[PDB]
Amino acid sequence: AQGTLYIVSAPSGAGKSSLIQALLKTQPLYDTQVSVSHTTRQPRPGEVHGEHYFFVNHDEFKEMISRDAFLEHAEVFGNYYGTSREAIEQVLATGVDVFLDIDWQGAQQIRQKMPHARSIFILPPSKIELDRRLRGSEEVIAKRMAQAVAEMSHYAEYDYLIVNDDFDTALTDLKTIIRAERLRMSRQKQRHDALISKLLA
Amino acid sequence: AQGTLYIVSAPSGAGKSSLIQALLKTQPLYDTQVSVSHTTRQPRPGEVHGEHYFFVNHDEFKEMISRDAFLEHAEVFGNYYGTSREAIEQVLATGVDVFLDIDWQGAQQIRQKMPHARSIFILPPSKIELDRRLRGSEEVIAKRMAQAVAEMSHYAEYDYLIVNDDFDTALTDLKTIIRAERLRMSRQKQRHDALISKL
Amino acid sequence: AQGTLYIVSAPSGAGKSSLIQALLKTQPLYDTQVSVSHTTRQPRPGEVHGEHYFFVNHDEFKEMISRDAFLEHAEVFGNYYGTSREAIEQVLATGVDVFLDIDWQGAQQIRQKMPHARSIFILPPSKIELDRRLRGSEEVIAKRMAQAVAEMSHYAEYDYLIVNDDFDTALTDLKTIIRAERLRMSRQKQRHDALISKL
Amino acid sequence: AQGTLYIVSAPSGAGKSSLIQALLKTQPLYDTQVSVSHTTRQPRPGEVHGEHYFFVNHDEFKEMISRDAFLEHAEVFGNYYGTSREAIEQVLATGVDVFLDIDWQGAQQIRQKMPHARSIFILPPSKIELDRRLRGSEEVIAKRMAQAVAEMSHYAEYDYLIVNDDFDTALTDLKTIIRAERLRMSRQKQRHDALISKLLA
Amino acid sequence: AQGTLYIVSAPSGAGKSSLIQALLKTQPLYDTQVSVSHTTRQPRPGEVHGEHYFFVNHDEFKEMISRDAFLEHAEVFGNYYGTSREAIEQVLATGVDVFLDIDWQGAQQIRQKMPHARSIFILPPSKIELDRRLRGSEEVIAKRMAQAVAEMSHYAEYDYLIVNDDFDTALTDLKTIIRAERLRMSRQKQRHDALISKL
Amino acid sequence: AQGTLYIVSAPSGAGKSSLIQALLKTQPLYDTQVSVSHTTRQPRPGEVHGEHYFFVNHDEFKEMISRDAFLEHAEVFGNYYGTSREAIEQVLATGVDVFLDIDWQGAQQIRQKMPHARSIFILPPSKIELDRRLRGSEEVIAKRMAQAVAEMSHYAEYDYLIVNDDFDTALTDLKTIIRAERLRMSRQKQRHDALISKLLA
């Protein structure tokens, strides 16, 4: 069958990464996966290539754009990020649900090419709290806070909203959406094709 | 703020009503409730008028039909069942999500009057298990299975499908569908209004 | 071995009583129970004397006051409510934890007679949601909201605060408070006495 | 706001480490953290510096004591261990709940400087069982068993007691204490400051 | 397809019956049920004939014994209790798992007639806690403790042992035993028949 | 006491590995462990020796067989795999429940030497699904599918059956079997020896 494509977006400091990482730890590669994006930003201490991202240089990323290799690409917080079309179409083909961690610009592009992709937006519990999480120079902090408020402007465009106040709760909300989507008729009629045959035949 | 209307259907013995009661005992009345349908069938030991059903006579049921008192109504195995429009509109306007335990016939009439409603169909894990649950004479049991096969055929008309093999597993699937529907933008926009404005 | 006394309070519509009943259905009588208060208010359909309340007449309630039969008592919206001292002392001496669903007035009188008691206050997630839950004429609803705002003002007098936005989330918070109180040294010292001596 | 300071103590072989590690795996760095202590003992296979501990040499640890750099320090099982005051005060300041894994000597020192710190003691289910866990030379085993019995002598000084018989259960007990503490009025009045305003205004 | 018969026993105050009711409220009738025993003891307030027990007179109980109506029967503290063979065989043939809340005496008679049955014995966490739960005059309480110590002595005759210290913990242990028994090859072979053939 | 010996078998692509790995992450080394088997196959990227397996060369494995060092050994998918008898008997002795991940050939050998070992078989939800998981050349895929169908032929020999459709569910089934086994009288009479004494004395 075909897996469902998920778009997950959020301002930095909403917990989106840890939520997605905690999610994957409970799902087998044959059911759920996160997509491997291409980026120009430097790998982070303890972040292997090809796994988290495909780290390429500014020129290398620019030649992929010409090659129309991207399903979408955008400039985010000083670097280029894009979704290799090959991987996404192949993984979805084997029936796997693929998670695309992307900013709102990328989300618009995908909604335009894959109308059935589902989008989830994640909001922090409050401004103060969003601020406390960001801090973890006041000039760089204000820069992240400005980008974070802009990103949140586009929340109403997504199908789902998870307010990540209490971590565990938001992690369950994220699991709950995945499961409810696999309970939809279209996917269930396929997964239980046999049984349905037996019951009506 | 209007609540969502859920349509749940299944052939007898799929475990439908015992899945709903387990769900409801986990939710307060201001969040979720189940509609109390009208019926001409005899009350079973334990059933109380107004609670499980509004048991009426064939004549009375007719009276209500003629006066458009039903959001939907239909005959299910030699008896009538209907959802009084009034009760539903009143509970929906208070923001409560309503569960409608009705057959595939009523489900259709509800889909038209409320295209926003979400419908869930429940299936037994096999025809043998179905048979077992149905048995609770070989003749009466074969006629029950006949009405079930007819119910199960309209399954594709529903948004969600739960194969209730393992009770808890299926109960968590129902709980999951309602939880996910509440995480939808339109619903969330409202209940989190002015948190998004503060942000 | 004496049990802990829990004070739970909230304005009407915060979901207080439906949070307690969900808790109690998860605990045996030798562990947790709820006190059955006395009241002069009319029994609501379903309520049974001795179970939910001990429904008495204004005269009778007065008699008990004059004879110091109440650990605490107060007038809540044109009616009297009180906790008979006797029932409580008897159940507390058997090691059972007791839940007191009472208003901010009774809570105070209980804090003095039992400084060891733990009090939990429950809040609705917003004034709109509060209003919605309260609506269950614009006049009667405004007077209900007025008595709620007055209840919510004494919230800081409580040890714990639960914002009951999502029912299950709030139910697990209550369950969590009672579980954590049982992990306290004084309580644990006793119930694990002679395990610590073996160690 | 200010996060709550936790003291967790236990005789070796009670499971205290694995409980604390399992705990952190479910909490974001912005809510819960374990403090990084200084020690003279050797790092263990697969234990990075600055993360688990700050591994220093005997002389280096001795000069920090003069510098009054420690909130507390003690000698435990042949080595020096201490809590750098800087980190603790800074992390707590950003509202984070910090866990201090320390012996009973350290616990006394902290209770004296931070009267609002909360302490949790963890006991094994029985002596035999404590013994089975220790074993994992009978001369070294008896030495750990003697130190372990001494440590347990000080249990009555802690606010909470978790009997770690069934792991999962003790892990839930440990999560349950953290959550119940964040439900206290003082911390809730701050976290929900806004809402309370709206409801009473 | 025949269901499994579970034997659950314990001394008064171990929390046995409140552990079973919590279990049953989590399972549908086509999966699990509890047998309604016969007894000569007086119905306690709330108990209903046919639901909790089949309350009969000493004469009537005798009549049934003489006519081999009991799969097992025994005297428990000055009264008779028995499991009507008929009800059990009927519910077992429908594939339902049956719970038998009976004493160590009945358990033995059941082990012989159904060697396939699984028996679970429940213990209090200590004699003090046992005493506390039992207290609900020092004389009547000492005689209760005497009958409990005698019950607890036949504990080794059971397949499983649950030390009900923490209610939820013990409830999950019961739930776990039934879930594991259902994962056994013989049971699974059947309910997953023709999935193994497709594979 | 003595821990219980578990045998877990399944055709490749049933999820058996990830289930067992997810299991261990929630159990302390003093309660549950997976046995370290000897094998001739190459270690996999990110798989340390002595931990997952004891990787030896074809000749080295052949000399262990002569030394009767194995409780069982078998040829599986092109390589030799065996269970060192030493480790198993020692770990079980300290009361630990040891998990043996082995094929059906090995399972028969163990059932013959350790009649009280408990065996769990894990089946995929369907043939198609088993196929989807395998794929992750059509000549090598058909080879795994043939071996996988053979392996499944021996399912009826095991005490338990877990159908790993929904991962989380199968993970709970696997936890549920372990716990129910520790609730058996024999093991409980030992674990609660003291209490029982007090209650009947």
Ligand SMILES: Nc1nc2c(ncn2[C@@H]2O[C@H](COP(=O)(O)OP(=O)(O)OP(=O)(O)OP(=O)(O)OP(=O)(O)OC[C@H]3O[C@@H](n4cnc5c(N)ncnc54)[C@H](O)[C@@H]3O)[C@@H](O)[C@H]2O)c(=O)[nH]1
């Ligand atoms: N179009 C497009 N866009 C793409 C693509 N790939 C990625 N993007 C976009 O690029 C951005 C991702 O950039 P990144 O550099 O990969 O960042 P990230 O790992 O996703 O995490 P962040 O942006 O920093 O925020 P986030 O808070 O979600 O992370 P988390 O790790 O949970 O953070 C934990 C939190 O805890 C705090 N914390 C840590 N320690 C703390 C302490 N002691 N006290 C208080 N708080 C503390 C931290 O400060 C942080 O807020 C996203 O906007 C994404 O959508 C693509 O292919 N296409």
Ligand SMILES: Nc1nc2c(ncn2[C@@H]2O[C@H](COP(=O)(O)OP(=O)(O)OP(=O)(O)OP(=O)(O)OP(=O)(O)OC[C@H]3O[C@@H](n4cnc5c(N)ncnc54)[C@H](O)[C@@H]3O)[C@@H](O)[C@H]2O)c(=O)[nH]1
């Ligand atoms: N259009 C419309 N339609 C409406 C409306 N209201 C109702 N309807 C339709 O009318 C029908 C309802 O008729 P009903 O007589 O009220 O039946 P019900 O209460 O819904 O229960 P069942 O038909 O038996 O099914 P169900 O499996 O869901 O019950 P459950 O509680 O799980 O049962 C437990 C199971 O366990 C078995 N069981 C019981 N005891 C057993 C034992 N000892 N051993 C083994 N199994 C045992 C039982 O046989 C049962 O299957 C449905 O098709 C419904 O959709 C309305 O307003 N409009």
Ligand SMILES: Nc1nc2c(ncn2[C@@H]2O[C@H](COP(=O)(O)OP(=O)(O)OP(=O)(O)OP(=O)(O)OP(=O)(O)OC[C@H]3O[C@@H](n4cnc5c(N)ncnc54)[C@H](O)[C@@H]3O)[C@@H](O)[C@H]2O)c(=O)[nH]1
């Ligand atoms: N000093 C003292 N004080 C005492 C003592 N005993 C009691 N009191 C005080 O007296 C008051 C209790 O009065 P009561 O008449 O007994 O009320 P109650 O049973 O406690 O229920 P409520 O006031 O309505 O609040 P609550 O929200 O907690 O109920 P809940 O069950 O969640 O309700 C469900 C919710 O859902 C709504 N709902 C219901 N149907 C709905 C529908 N169709 N759609 C939408 N919403 C719907 C309802 O309106 C309700 O809010 C409390 O303030 C208490 O503290 C005592 O001994 N001493």
Ligand SMILES: Nc1nc2c(ncn2[C@@H]2O[C@H](COP(=O)(O)OP(=O)(O)OP(=O)(O)OP(=O)(O)OP(=O)(O)OC[C@H]3O[C@@H](n4cnc5c(N)ncnc54)[C@H](O)[C@@H]3O)[C@@H](O)[C@H]2O)c(=O)[nH]1
């Ligand atoms: N004042 C002060 N004090 C400080 C400070 N920092 C640390 N300390 C103190 O120093 C001590 C910590 O020393 P450490 O060297 O860091 O030890 P640790 O990692 O904390 O673990 P242990 O002491 O060995 O015991 P624990 O049983 O709790 O660990 P765990 O990993 O769960 O163990 C798993 C268990 O399973 C067993 N196991 C393993 N395999 C087994 C097998 N096959 N069979 C049976 N059992 C098996 C193991 O043997 C072990 O018991 C503590 O007393 C701490 O309070 C500080 O800053 N200030």
Ligand SMILES: Nc1nc2c(ncn2[C@@H]2O[C@H](COP(=O)(O)OP(=O)(O)OP(=O)(O)OP(=O)(O)OP(=O)(O)OC[C@H]3O[C@@H](n4cnc5c(N)ncnc54)[C@H](O)[C@@H]3O)[C@@H](O)[C@H]2O)c(=O)[nH]1
């Ligand atoms: N052979 C055979 N035998 C059969 C058969 N049927 C029954 N029997 C045997 O007959 C006996 C049953 O007698 P019964 O009179 O029916 O008793 P029961 O309903 O089974 O309840 P108990 O004896 O009191 O024990 P249990 O602790 O299990 O109840 P629980 O509901 O947890 O109770 C809650 C606990 O909390 C305490 N409690 C209550 N209120 C309290 C308060 N305020 N404070 C503190 N504690 C309080 C209570 O005292 C109780 O311990 C059992 O030994 C059973 O095995 C049969 O067919 N055949």
Ligand SMILES: Nc1nc2c(ncn2[C@@H]2O[C@H](COP(=O)(O)OP(=O)(O)OP(=O)(O)OP(=O)(O)OP(=O)(O)OC[C@H]3O[C@@H](n4cnc5c(N)ncnc54)[C@H](O)[C@@H]3O)[C@@H](O)[C@H]2O)c(=O)[nH]1
């Ligand atoms: N006698 C004896 N026998 C022994 C001994 N030791 C081991 N054996 C036997 O040797 C075999 C083990 O060989 P191994 O090389 O160690 O393999 P393994 O790690 O156990 O995993 P596999 O055999 O490949 O299957 P499995 O599906 O169970 O793994 P998992 O990692 O869950 O797989 C994840 C799944 O997801 C799929 N996947 C991954 N990515 C996917 C994607 N994008 N889309 C769809 N599916 C995707 C993968 O393809 C895989 O099916 C077993 O048959 C075992 O019983 C011993 O001492 N004695």
